[PDB]
Amino acid sequence: EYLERGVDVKFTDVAGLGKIRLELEEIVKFFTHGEMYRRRGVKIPGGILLCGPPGVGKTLLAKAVAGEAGVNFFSISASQFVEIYVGVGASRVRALYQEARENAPSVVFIDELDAVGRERGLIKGSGGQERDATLNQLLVSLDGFEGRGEVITIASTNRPDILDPALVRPGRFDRKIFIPKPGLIGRMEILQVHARKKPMAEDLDYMAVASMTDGMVGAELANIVEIAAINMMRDGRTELTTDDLLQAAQIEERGMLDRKDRSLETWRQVAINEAAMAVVAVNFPDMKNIEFLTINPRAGRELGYVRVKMDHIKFKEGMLSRQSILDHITVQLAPRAADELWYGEDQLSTIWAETSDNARSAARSLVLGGLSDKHHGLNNFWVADRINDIDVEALRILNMCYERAKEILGRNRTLMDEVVEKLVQKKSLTKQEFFTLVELYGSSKPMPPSILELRKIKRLELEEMVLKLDMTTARNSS
Amino acid sequence: LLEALKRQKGTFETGQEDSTEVPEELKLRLAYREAAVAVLACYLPDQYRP
Incomplete structure (x- = not known):
């Protein structure tokens, strides 16, 4: 009933394994070299649980480890256990474990345990009691009484x-x-x-495709493979290249590119918006590497966008500097800066209302995230005066970022006009030509020193001061 | 035994291939934080947690 046939998936069929694969073959070792395991006196660990983002193919790993183990494979959905009737689910688990024990040696797989592994006492209903009964039955058949030493359960949550x-x-x-x-x-x-089953080329570089589609699951990569088949017959070329993969990734991460009727001033407005974002971003360290710059409207975003790929290690761990956020708020405010500096103060538009609120939200998160210097962080107080003053620093921070954006965009008027003209004429821009225009018409951008130079100057100052103290002790004493 | 204890108290939570080039700006920050903790702990001696 719960037994499947034709399990030929192995570890070669699955990629992106890493050291986890070692644990996987350890499981295979548990199914092959267990004689010396129990000879030394080791009870085989029955419970192995894979936890991760969806679409990584946990059930595919289950098929792989079952095929490499060479035992009977059971793959049971956990959604069948919960039901409006009671007792039948417990009997289902009993029959499942009984036929697993009879088919020993074997491995059993149950996916999405969150449906039935919920903590008891969270929902008040008959379904909760049935879930409790099924959880109790699986618990007893797992560890309750003796009789299992050969059946191993694998789960995916x-x-x-x-x-x-x-x-x-x-x-x-x-x-x-x-x-x-x-x-x-x-x-x-x-x-x-995922692309071995289709005829590929020898000049096909996956490095650019992998770096283009960062932070995505294996199901999304299979989708990229699926959009590597449908879209080349419009032009009718010979063999698949990396350009089609790059365009497929661009389509997938944002949406399909649709063209609609548009006037000249609308294109100019979107162009000066994108120019504001890119021009204020290139002078900042965390957002310096702008790679793409287009004003073409996409699905859900009638605006253009600027593409940057900063370091993705400090962002996840939380090691972003205070100046790294004061720069981003300036970046979000700079569309309004360009609008004010070009169309005047009395003719402010509403196209930058999506970045002008991101800037104020970032400032609000900064002032009560402990990153300020009012007393020393201190995001919470007791009296109403300090609570009111908490929201004052955010608005002054927005104001100083605002004037900084005005100064930055006012320093760069010639390159501003040039990049706006290029954006209107070509509707798109890559890194090379945009950076070439930046080098042709850029202003001075004196970079503040990093932490290494500050540590070096502080260290040499400390050494010279301590040796000064040493001589003022020595020659006054000797 | 040390590795069994390390696994059993759940020190690791990322569970990824631990191969990451840490910048000098991060090693420096961690070293300075740890050194400051050491200096404050030695200067303010805790009678129960050396």
Whole structure:
């Protein structure tokens, strides 16, 4: 009933494995070299749990480990256990584990345990009691009484916090492996394996495709493979190249590119908006590497956009400087800066209303995120005066970013006009020509020193001061 | 035993391939934070948590 046939998926069929694959073959070792495991006196860990983002193919990993183990594979949806009737789900789990024990050696797979592994006492209904009964039955058949030493359960969940800590107890689910999102090499190999079934070329570089589509799951890479088949018959070329992959990634991350009727002043407004964003971004460290610049409207965004790929390590861990946010707020305010400096103060538009609120929200998050210097951080107080003063610093921070944006955009009028003209004539711009225009008409951008130079100057000042103290002690004493 | 204890208290939570080029600006910040903690702990001696 719950037994599947034709499980031929192996570890070669799945990419983006990494060191987790080692644990996977450890499971295979648990199914092959277990004689010396129990000879040394090791009870085989029954509970292995894969946790990660959806679409990474956890069930594909289950098929791979089942095929490499060479045992019977059971793949049961957890949604069938919950039902309006009680007792039948417990009997379903009983029959499942009984036929797993009879088919020993075997591995059993249950996906999305969050449906039935919810902590008891969170919902008041008969479905909650049925879920409790099924959880109790699976708990007993896992660890309750003796009789299982050969059947091993593999599970795939998304949210590990929802699970009952009774299930997380060792001997029931003790091995917890996280499947992360694929990095750079992982996306490369997933694209390779999903593209092995189609005729590819020898000049096909996956490095640019992987760097273009950053922070995406393996299902999204399979989708990129799926949009590598449908769109070349419009022109009718010979063999697939990397340009089609780049355009497919561009279509997927934003939407399909649609063209509508448009006047000249509307194009000019979108162009000066995008010029404001890119020109204020290039002079800042965290948003310096602008790679794309287009004003073409897309799905959901009638505006253009500026593409930057900053370092994605400090952002996740939280090591972004205070100046790194005062720069971003200036970037969000700079569309309004260009609008005010070009159309005057009395003719402000409403196209920058989406960035002008991001700037104020970022300032508000900064002032009560402990990053300020009013007393020392201190995002909370007691009396109403300091609570009122909490929101004063955000508005002064917006004001100083606002004047900074005015100064930055006023320094760069010639390159502003040039990039606006190019954006109107070509409707798109890449990194090379935009940076060439920047070098042709740019102003001076004196870079503030990084932390290394500050540490070096502080260290040399400290050494010279301490040796000054040493001589003022020595020659006064000697 | 040390690795079993390290796994069993759940120190790791990312669960990814631990191969990341850490910038000098981060090693410096961590070293300075740890050194400041060491200096304050040695100057203000805690009678129970050295």
